[PDB]
DNA sequence: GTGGATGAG
DNA sequence: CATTCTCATCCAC
């Protein structure tokens with residue numbers, strides 16, 4: 001396969017610099033509550049880190065311009081514009097978070113090679129960096145295939161910049177793991193292509209186990225408990241003991257990843273399968289409060305159903321108690337689903353408060369720290 | 380289907 | 389560690 005991973009540069013900060021170009025010459029960070037969730041490259045050179053506490057950021061970089069990024073409407077809107085632009089190149093585009101997309105270019109590459117003539121194959125040319133500086137063998141089929149990929153990735157980024165004013169990086173490789181690992185080698189606004197003989201050099205470069213996809217905090221804790229603390233430890237661990245510890249498909253998967261093998265296909269994401277709205281806070285402790293919060297969250301949600309075309313057939317309420325989340329969910333009554341000029345707030349809040357009182361014993365003190373509404377089962 | 384664990388940015 | 393504010397998959401129930 002030829003796979004591309006496209007990753008937008010400091011995405012939230014970029015959207016803000018487009019929303020307000022008075023900002024693009026200054027160090028800029030996007031704040032959510034007490035965290036600077038991301039910042040532009042001017043800020044990073046001054047020592048601002050992703051997800052940095054506001055106190056640390058004020059002390060380190062008092063010049064930092066901070067814009068509030070708690071409302072994701074604009075980021076979400078730009079995000080979908082990006083994947084839909086990419087869907088002009090191939091029908092199958094896999095989203096990861098708001099600012100990453102994978103595309104399987106192998107169909108398109110194969111078409112381009114068929115169209116190619118004898119004299120200008122000579123004469124195929126790289127777009128962007130070649131990982132680890134290795135030289136292209138224009139006589140190697142796989143090399144040619146990846147170079148054509150790099151040219152497409154270049155056209156993708158050109159379309160993005162022209163149509164949307166957005167800059168990002170791309171990585172081109174034989175699978176999703178590798179494409180995503182290589183896209184960030186040169187940052188920001190650059191692209192790199194991974195040729196197969198230097199794949200092993202790329203996986204060697206990983207310093208920590210949590211740098212493998214799908215190995216989060218909990219999985220790393222499990223592996224730590226089996227004596228596996230590093231990537232080489234994982235490569236080196238008995239497959240059969242690991243299968244009898246994590247399960248067959250998880251063990252085989254995460255072990256393949258550590259040798260750079262990833263056969264997962266690129267899957268079309270499409271529109272969200274669920275919309276939610278949420279807010280975190282120090283204390284909710286009353287039903288009256290937690291009602292007003294829900295009404296607010298629900299109001300935002302209803303604006304988004306309206307946009308979208310499909311109707312939710314279920315609603316989910318989510319809480320976080322002081323000191324993970326809890327949810328209940330239930331079906332939305334058929335008569336409420338036909339809403340779109342009527343009063344849907346009242347029966348919807350009625351349902352959500354029943355869900356709330358099911359989870360929270362209001363006859364006794366409580367103390368929430370997050371509330372989310374969610375619409376799912378979308379038809 | 381429902382609700383919790385765990386992954387992604 | 390999560391934290392933020394989302395969105396997704398897996399699986400016992």
Ligand SMILES: Nc1ncnc2c1ncn2[C@H]1CC[C@@H](COP(=O)(O)OP(=O)(O)O)O1
Pocket residue numbers: 007008009010011012013037038039050051099188388
């Ligand atoms: N739990 C999390 N882990 C990692 N990133 C997160 C998390 N929560 C929010 N984010 C945001 C913070 C940075 C952002 C992705 O990077 P961004 O696009 O801003 O910069 P880059 O140019 O480095 O790709 O994802």
Ligand SMILES: [Ca+2]
Pocket residue numbers: 007008009010011099
């Ligand atoms: Ca990014």
Ligand SMILES: [Ca+2]
Pocket residue numbers: 210211212213215
């Ligand atoms: Ca990681």
Ligand SMILES: [Ca+2]
Pocket residue numbers: 268269270271272273
């Ligand atoms: Ca989907």
Ligand SMILES: [Ca+2]
Pocket residue numbers: none
């Ligand atoms: Ca995480």
